[model samples]
Target: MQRGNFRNQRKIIKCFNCGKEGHIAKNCRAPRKRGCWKCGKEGHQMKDCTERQAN
Candidate 1:
C-alpha cells in the first residue's frame, strides 16, 4: 500500500502570443501570433475565418 500528500500547487502558465512565462495570452503585449484551428492559417482566427465559408 502507498500513501501520498495532497497540497495546493501553482500551475505554470506560458503566454501563447509572446511565448513567455508568468503571463496569459490574452494579456500579452506582443502582437497576435497564433494559428487558426479550422483552416490552419497564420493570420486570422477560427471565428473570423473566411476561407471555408463558401460551400
Candidate 2:
C-alpha cells in the first residue's frame, strides 16, 4: 500500500462589512452610532483588531 499525498491548508475568514481578510464580519472596523465590544463599534469583533485608540 502507498500513502496519498496530503497538504495542510489554512482558511481565513474576513469581515463581510470590511474588505479585510483573516477575520469575520462580526469583527469589522467601521464607524457607527452605536459602539461595539469587538471593534468598539456596532458591527465587529476584536479578534484581529486594527485600532490605535488610547485605552
Candidate 3:
C-alpha cells in the first residue's frame, strides 16, 4: 500500500521590475514600491504602482 502526503511550502515570487525573489513588488502593499528607483516616477517606487509622468 502507498500513502500520499502533502507538504506545506512557502511561495516566493520574483519582482517584475527588480526581478528579486519574494513577491511581485509591482503591486505590493508596503507604502511605496521597493524598486522605484529604476522607475521614472517622482513620488513612490515603481513596483508599487503603474502611474507614469507625462514628458
Candidate 4:
C-alpha cells in the first residue's frame, strides 16, 4: 500500500497491472483475466503463488 493522507482528503489508487482505481493490482477484483508477476499464472500473485517447478 502506498502513502495516504486523510482527515480532509480523498483519492483513488491505480493497479500496477490492470490499472484500476479502488485497489492495487495484487488485490484487484476486475472482471478480466490476469497473470501473476512471478509465475505468470492467473488469479494469484508471487507471494501466494503455488509453484509447479523448482525455485
Q: What is the C-alpha lDDT of each candidate?
A: 0.73, 0.60, 0.60, 0.67
Tens digits of lDDT, candidate 4, 1-55: 7766846654556667777566866776666456686777777767777665666
Ranking by lDDT: 1, 4, 3, 2
After superposing candidate 2 on the true structure, give the runs of residues whose Cα lies further than 4 Å from its correct spot.
1-12, 30-55
> What does the lDDT come to for candidate 3?
0.60
lDDT of 1 by residue, 1-55 (tens): 6756854665648777778887887787875567786777778787778775575
Give the per-residue lDDT digits (tens) of candidate 2, residues 15-55.
Answer: 66766676677766655454457556755546645566667
Clash pairs (backbone) in predicted model 2: 13-23, 26-44, 26-45, 27-45, 36-41
Error of 1 at 20 (Å): 0.6
Deviation (Å) of 34 in candidate 4 = 14
User: Which candidate gets the maximum TM-score versus the true structure?
Assistant: 1
Quality of model 1 by C-alpha lDDT: 0.73
Sort by TM-score, top down from the best: 1, 4, 2, 3
Residue 24 CA displacement from its true place in model 2, Å: 0.6
